[PDB]
Design a protein around this ligand. Structure first.
Ligand SMILES: NC(=O)c1ccc[n+]([C@@H]2O[C@H](COP(=O)([O-])OP(=O)(O)OC[C@H]3O[C@@H](n4cnc5c(N)ncnc54)[C@H](O)[C@@H]3O)[C@@H](O)[C@H]2O)c1
Ligand SMILES: NC(=O)c1ccc[n+]([C@@H]2O[C@H](COP(=O)([O-])OP(=O)(O)OC[C@H]3O[C@@H](n4cnc5c(N)ncnc54)[C@H](O)[C@@H]3O)[C@@H](O)[C@H]2O)c1
Ligand SMILES: C[C@@H](O)[C@H](N)C(=O)O
Ligand SMILES: C[C@@H](O)[C@H](N)C(=O)O
Lengths: 309, 315
């Protein structure tokens, strides 16, 4: 049995059915503190900050594996660092301790480029590098990777993690995140509405499309334990672009599209992150690969977003 | 008014009177979960994992600065990672948040070479480097540095830290760490007994003598704001040695002692850490310096330990 925490978020929304298709509907349980449609898949309310809740769920459902998605992200984190610490720090600690006590074969955690800071090289960054995050989210996330690796080295709990870039998707609505301009922009485009972008025109960031994001997570999950070396902190990426680049490419498709730049705190967050990642380790150790290049993602998004409008 | 957290430990035991001497006994409050003689300086019971206790102390004594020493060290930490997490991680958060909410001007935190891991370069490591610790202790400590820096950048709270190497001292006996052998060996030397060392004969580690350690922390506390660029994570060191080197140098003074090597878990810990540090940043930004080189530390420790053990009577 697989438990997914924070199932209602950007990734959860799609991962749950992905897991059900791969491993069977009876074998997944979705969980969050906020409920959404899981298409029949079993759902339970679970606050990761309550260790007890976790202990109870893991027992009652005979949980074998956990995809621990619950968290506060970079923007919200700057708005409410105490909340981020509680959910991310406390929450992740609770998950690890609970998993370690019980028979938890595997815990998979989505980490982030948010673990990087200004001292981290901006281009082709390898996984082993400077990690001096400047956001409460980032601090919590590097802590997560370190804890995870510790639990593995110390207790033999199989914790695995990769570092996602910005994820572009259509199934779940964006949530005003630092990288979410890359999703919002498509909504505006299909309506031929001028977009007001909160990141600088030339703010380059690594990104990837959700189909590849889901595949990566699952490939990491599936990898053979004795075959991972790095194990936690795998950089993964598909492409790097700036808001003006993404806009220009969209406009090639939807020429009436316009944009204006009104940068805010989220730009400042982004500025602390690298521009592009080296994802060799993930490819070598577990065969991470990308099926959707930028063009494909752009057209797929326009296709899906107009049509769901 | 200065509060010291974890004052009963190796560092606290000496920092408390060091602080009182410099700023006055009335302006220093010692605190710990375990009391020990403070030589007339005010002591209060305080468990840092209990936020309400911190709040009460800070309120009552109008605390202006906190030297936050409370914590579980590398070895003890591996025996009880859950204790280390609770004390180190949530204790530090509690301190930071309390200071912020109250009007504590400065917080100083002693970090550690424990923040480093196998991937960290072994020689003359600088402050900005790979930080992938493999002890719970080390995880908490890097978290502490990051949180401390966050508290400055986010809220404007003046949080500072340096990274200590192993510290050698004679006033208090360290118990819960990996670098302790460098204190232990002197007791055996002075008694002319065989020392059983728990680290490999070749296990190089950076180290420094307490006097220099105390000065460093206080110098960082007093440093001009305008030069504090790195702010958190300053590497500091005096010298690097292996147990076989230290033994050999002590033997130069006291020929009639010996050593055997029976490595334990602690050696595995030490193996993950770098051998030597580059402390340039500390010297550049706040004037870090060392007064006790290796020889002077060895001779001073022999002196004081001999007196402590009645090899040479107090006069
Ligand atoms: N989306 C991305 O581009 C991205 C990139 C890197 C890392 N990540 C990581 O992936 C995970 C989820 O990402 P997402 O985009 O789906 O986030 P999201 O904001 O869409 O979803 C997060 C979920 O966490 C839930 N939550 C908050 N507090 C909780 C608590 N105490 N107990 C249980 N649930 C709680 C929210 O209600 C929400 O449904 C996080 O760990 C995040 O840091 C995401
Ligand atoms: N001694 C060193 O070589 C060295 C090196 C690097 C960093 N440091 C740091 O210096 C600080 C103290 O070092 P030390 O060598 O004196 O340690 P120590 O083990 O000698 O003393 C630690 C003190 O922490 C106290 N303590 C434990 N839990 C507590 C709690 N919940 N509330 C209040 N007090 C609590 C203990 O009772 C003890 O008196 C730590 O933060 C440590 O990580 C020390
Ligand atoms: C990708 C990750 O950093 C997240 N989407 C954020 O905006 O914080
Ligand atoms: C190195 C420092 O953290 C402490 N002396 C230890 O042994 O843990």
């Amino acid at each position: 049995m697989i438990l997914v925490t924070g199932s209602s978020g950007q990734i959860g929304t799609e991962l749950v059915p992905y897991l059900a298709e791969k491993y069977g509907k009876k074998n997944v349980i979705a969980s969050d503190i906020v409920q959404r449609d899981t298409g029949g898949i079993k759902f339970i309310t679970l606050d990761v900050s309550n260790r007890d809740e976790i202990d109870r769920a893991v027992e009652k459902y005979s949980i074998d594996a956990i995809f621990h998605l619950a968290g506060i992200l970079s923007a919200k984190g700057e708005k409410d660092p105490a909340l981020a610490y509680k959910v991310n720090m406390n929450g992740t600690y609770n998950i690890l301790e609970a998993a370690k006590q019980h028979r938890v074969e595997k815990v998979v955690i989505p980490s982030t480029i948010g673990v990087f800071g200004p001292e981290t090289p901006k281009n082709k960054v390898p996984s082993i590098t400077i990690t001096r995050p400047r956001t409460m989210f980032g601090v919590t996330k590097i802590a997560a990777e370190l804890l995870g690796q510790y639990y593995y080295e110390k207790f033999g709990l199989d914790v695995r993690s990769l570092r996602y870039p910005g994820i572009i998707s259509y199934k779940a609505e964006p949530t005003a995140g630092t990288t979410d301009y890359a999703v919002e922009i498509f909504y505006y485009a299909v309506k031929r509405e001028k977009y007001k972008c909160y990141l600088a025109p030339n703010r380059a960031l690594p990104m990837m499309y959700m189909p590849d994001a889901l595949k990566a997570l699952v490939d990491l999950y599936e990898a053979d334990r004795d075959k991972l070396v790095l194990r936690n902190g795998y950089n993964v990426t598909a492409y790097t672009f700036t808001p003006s680049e993404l806009y220009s490419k969209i406009k090639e498709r939807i020429p009436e599209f316009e944009i204006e730049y009104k940068e805010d705190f989220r730009d400042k967050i982004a500025a602390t992150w690298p521009e592009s990642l080296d994802s060799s380790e993930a490819s070598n150790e577990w065969g991470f690969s990308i099926e959707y290049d930028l063009d494909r993602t752009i057209d797929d998004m326009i296709d899906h977003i107009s049509e769901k409008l």
